[PDB]
């Protein structure tokens, strides 16, 4: 029905889509299982 | 809610595409019809330019002539024109200029004067109950006067 | 609540899925119009390569033994901690009963099939009301 959410940060509008390999997703999920946050940002905040 | 605190894109501070600062543009259901019906005319001139090389019947007929212009994917705008026209009592942009002159004379917020011009009320308590933001920001006698001049500006078309 | 994925051909839609599964190509395809139904097929043989529900059930457990580089004091403290939590479950009788039954069957030179059938029978009986005792020797024999 074209619906999205992100749990724990109150977002239902700004959702980005990215194409990453499945092994990289395994790495990110293992880091999240290891109490490490691999936060991904499509914009450059440091500039 | 309705406490003069809208969203981020609906804040009092707006920015145009040139980079300058502009106040939020709030429209009541009077000139809001003349602006859509207005721009659709120049849109029809733009559609007939590249082609080279009683109150309800005219409304629906013009909405058909403009429906032929568009690709048949925006009929909710025409039904919105029937909604506004069925709920509009104003006409001619000159009188609308007078209405803005009466709304800006009190020094209120654009959303507040939009809710003032968009609602048909007879007493001040009606305007204070339908508009929760206006209850002490302006005198009641002045609102009744505005409703009197507006009552003289409305005419059955 | 539902959660049952059923593959159908939207072009054929004439019969329940009478499909064929191509494992070499990793797809599943309708055997009529030839249209593929799914790509990237998973395997069950490949995940099994690295590796008992009938008796142990869904219970999980892990051993703690000594390490390559460790102290003998920590090995005893971890085993004594499990010795205090061993009362949380009444499954100590199944491992000891299967151990003694294992010793008797290994002493009688009976095949493993009779051992598994006897263990399955003792698991069916276990601790019911109609047993009401017998001092663990008669239920084993």
């Amino acid at each position: 029905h074209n619906q999205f959410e992100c749990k724990g940060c109150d977002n239902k509008i700004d959702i980005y889509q990215i194409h990453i390999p499945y092994a990289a997703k395994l790495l990110f999920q293992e880091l999240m299982a290891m109490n490490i946050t691999p936060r991904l940002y499509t914009d450059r905040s440091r500039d | 809610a309705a406490t003069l605190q809208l969203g981020q894109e609906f804040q009092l501070k707006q920015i145009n595409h040139q980079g300058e600062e502009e106040e939020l543009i709030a429209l009541n259901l009077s000139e809001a019809r003349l602006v859509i019906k207005e721009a659709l005319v120049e849109r029809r001139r733009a559609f007939k330019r590249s082609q080279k090389k009683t109150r309800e019947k005219e409304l629906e007929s013009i909405d058909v002539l403009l429906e032929q212009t568009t690709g048949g994917n925006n009929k909710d705008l025409k039904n919105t024109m029937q909604y506004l026209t069925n709920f509009s009592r104003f006409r001619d942009q000159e009188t609308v200029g007078a209405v803005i002159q009466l709304l800006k004379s009190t020094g209120l917020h654009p959303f507040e004067v939009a809710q003032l011009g968009s609602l048909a009320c007879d007493t001040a308590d009606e305007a204070k109950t339908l508009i929760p933001s206006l209850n002490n920001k302006i005198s009641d006698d002045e609102l009744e006067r505005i409703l009197k001049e507006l009552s003289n500006l409305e005419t059955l078309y | 609540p539902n959660l049952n994925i059923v593959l159908t051909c939207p072009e054929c839609k004439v019969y329940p899925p009478k499909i064929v599964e191509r494992f070499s190509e990793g797809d599943v395809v309708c055997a009529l119009c030839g249209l593929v139904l799914s790509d990237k097929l998973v395997d069950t043989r490949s995940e099994w390569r690295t590796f008992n529900p009938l008796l142990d059930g869904n219970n999980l457990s892990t051993r703690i033994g000594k390490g390559e580089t460790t102290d003998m004091r920590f090995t005893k403290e971890l085993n004594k901690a499990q010795g205090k939590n061993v009362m949380d479950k009444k499954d100590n009788e199944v491992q000891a009963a299967f151990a003694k039954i294992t010793m008797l069957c290994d002493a009688a030179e009976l095949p493993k099939i009779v051992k598994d059938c006897a263990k399955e029978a003792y698991k069916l009986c276990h601790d019911e009301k109609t047993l009401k005792g017998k001092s663990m020797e008669s239920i084993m024999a």
Partner: protein
Amino acid sequence: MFFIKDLSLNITLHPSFFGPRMKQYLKTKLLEEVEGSCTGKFGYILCVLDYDNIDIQRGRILPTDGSAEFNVKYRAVVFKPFKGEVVDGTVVSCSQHGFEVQVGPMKVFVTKHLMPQDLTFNAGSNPPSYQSSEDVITIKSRIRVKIEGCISQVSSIHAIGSIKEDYLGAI
């Protein structure tokens, strides 16, 4: 509310549309997608003002597929609902939970519990109408509804109204 806001949209074009007249195509697409549709951030987009002075900026080529991406900045007339906003509308569909008021392009719903006690539901009439102690709420009847809450989902916006408070109900 009927507001006017400058919106920006990224238009994707197929490599077959790279003729000299492509700008026109842009505007064409810029109409077909924007007018009539809806967004959860700016509300129901009604019209698009300023069709001649449409900025095109510069088109960029994304890697694969070879399609062209454009960033267009324009001025448009949109409609955005708000919570606790007195509006007017006409009923379309009727239900035992309440009648569905039609306010412009938005179909607001009014819960039966959010109605006064004298307003009762009547199914024996054709169409089923809500009869009160003085007013009869039918399909073609005009009702002033005070919107209590609004939902801003992507490309879909629904709101909930009420008429229990004073100075409300049928027009």
